[PDB]
Amino acid sequence: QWDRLVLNTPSFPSNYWDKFVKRKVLDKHGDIFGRERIAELLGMDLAS
Amino acid sequence: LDLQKDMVVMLLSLLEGNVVNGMIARQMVDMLVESSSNVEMILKFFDMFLKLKDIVGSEAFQDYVTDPRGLISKKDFQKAMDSQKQFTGPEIQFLLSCSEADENEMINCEEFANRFQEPARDIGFNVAVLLTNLSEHVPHDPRLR
Numbered sequence: 001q002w003d004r005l006v007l008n009t010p011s012f013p014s015n016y017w018d019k020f021v022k023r024k025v026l027d028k029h030g031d032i033f034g035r036e037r038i039a040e041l042l043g044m045d046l047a048s
Numbered sequence: 049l050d051l052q053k054d055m056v057v058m059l060l061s062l063l064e065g066n067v068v069n070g071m072i073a074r075q076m077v078d079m080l081v082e083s084s085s086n087v088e089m090i091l092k093f094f095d096m097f098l099k100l101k102d103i104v105g106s107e108a109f110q111d112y113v114t115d116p117r118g119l120i121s122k123k124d125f126q127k128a129m130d131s132q133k134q135f136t137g138p139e140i141q142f143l144l145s146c147s148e149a150d151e152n153e154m155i156n157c158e159e160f161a162n163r164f165q166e167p168a169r170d171i172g173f174n175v176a177v178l179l180t181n182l183s184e185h186v187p188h189d190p191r192l193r
Contacts, residue, residue, distance in 0.1 A: 031133050034108040 008043030049171045052090075056174040063178075066185055073185045080182075081191045094172050096139060097164045103132050104161040119154040122147065 006012050013019050022042040030038045039046050059076065066073050080087055103109050112128035113120045120128070122144055129140045147155040183192055 031131065032103075032106050032108060034111060037107065 007041055010043065012042070049167050053171040053174050056171065056178055059178060060174070060181065063181055063185070066181075068185050068187070070185060073182055074189075077182060077186055077189055077192055090175070094168060094175070096135070096143070097161075097168065099134055100143060101161045101165060103129070103134065104157045106132065108132065109157075113157065115154070117154075118156070118158070119150075120157050122149050122153045122155060125155055125157075 013021055018024075022044055025042060026035060026038045026044065035046065038044075062072055063076065108131060109128045112124045112131070114124070115121075125144065125147065126140060129135050129143065135143065147160050149155045179192075186192060
């Protein structure tokens with residue numbers, strides 16, 4: 001419940017080395033869940 | 049489909065008592081390899097409709113569904129299927145042909161996704177059992193992989 005607060009934060013992976021977790025999650029999860037829905041959950045700007 | 053189940057039951061009976069790398073198991077693998085394209089077609093039928101049931105319940109697909117009655121037009125169905133990127137163009141065309149769209153080109157996705165589930169369950173399970181049996185009793189056969 002608390003970790004739900006960092007998903008959309010611009011600095012989610014600050015200490016963890018993998019800085020592309022959001023990209024990875026969106027690519028596997030997005031077709032079945034919706035790319036825009038995943039981008040909103042992870043605070044990603046698809047255009048940029 | 050029930051007749052296919054009976055035939056697969058006969059094949060499993062032929063496999064009764066089979067040993068690893070048994071002659072009858074190897075002959076059955078040869079028969080399946082000889083029928084490769086048709087076996088592939090049957091497996092693709094089962095896989096396509098299982099994936100259809102999985103997709104129709106997905107949030108992304110339901111986003112393309114908008115009509116109050118819950119019916120999706122053929123064109124919205126095509127758009128939704130393309131987005132999921134799990135079916136090919138010919139596969140989506142075949143699904144549209146099977147969809148049984150009404151006079152207004154509206155598909156009842158729930159009925160379409162549940163139509164072939166119960167009828168194909170017995171033969172599907174028996175095919176899974178046959179493949180598992182053959183795989184476990186003919187371990188090093190790249191053709192069965």
